[PDB]
Design a protein around this ligand. Sequence first.
Ligand SMILES: Nc1nc2c(ncn2[C@@H]2O[C@H](COP(=O)(O)OP(=O)(O)O)[C@@H](O)[C@H]2O)c(=O)[nH]1
Ligand SMILES: [Mg+2]
Length: 175
Amino acid sequence: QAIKCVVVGDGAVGKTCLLISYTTNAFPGEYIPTVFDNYSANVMDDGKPVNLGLWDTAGQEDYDRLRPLSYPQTDVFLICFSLVSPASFENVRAKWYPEVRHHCPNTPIILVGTKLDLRDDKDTIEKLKEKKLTPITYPQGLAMAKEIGAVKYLECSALTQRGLKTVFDEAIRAV
Ligand SMILES: Nc1nc2c(ncn2[C@@H]2O[C@H](COP(=O)(O)OP(=O)(O)O)[C@@H](O)[C@H]2O)c(=O)[nH]1
Ligand SMILES: [Mg+2]
């Protein structure tokens, strides 16, 4: 059957690269599509075939009025945040969880930390330290996942593809 999965989260957390890296097995290097689109994947999981529909969204505030038009008939949401952006992590509960629950009270949510490959990057750490900030640790994300009652907390990197298949694998299992 068909599953509708919608991806939301701050601008430049990597939502488009997340979707493109998953469906093509390739990270787009300077070639990131600018057209907001929905993608697809036919996958085998636990025995049955599945048509997973993936809906990208514009995460900037300029789209707050239009973005929810993609929400009807959603089966599962992915709320994304950059593991190396505390502001994006904060916006999970400041913006994204409220907005999702406001329109879709009972749809399961998957909390996804993105850009896992940057959590150990010396330059990213030092730049964050200039703001007295630190990358989001796994226990941090887990706790956030439990605060908003997400069915699962998962971390991934669209660049290395580490932990990327699990994200969409678990979003199907959530449905
Ligand atoms: N290092 C790293 N950079 C990433 C990753 N995913 C996305 N990016 C970068 O983050 C930027 C925004 O990605 P994009 O998918 O457009 O985010 P969106 O605005 O949420 O769609 C791009 O400049 C990518 O180079 C990742 O897993 N690792
Ligand atoms: Mg995008």
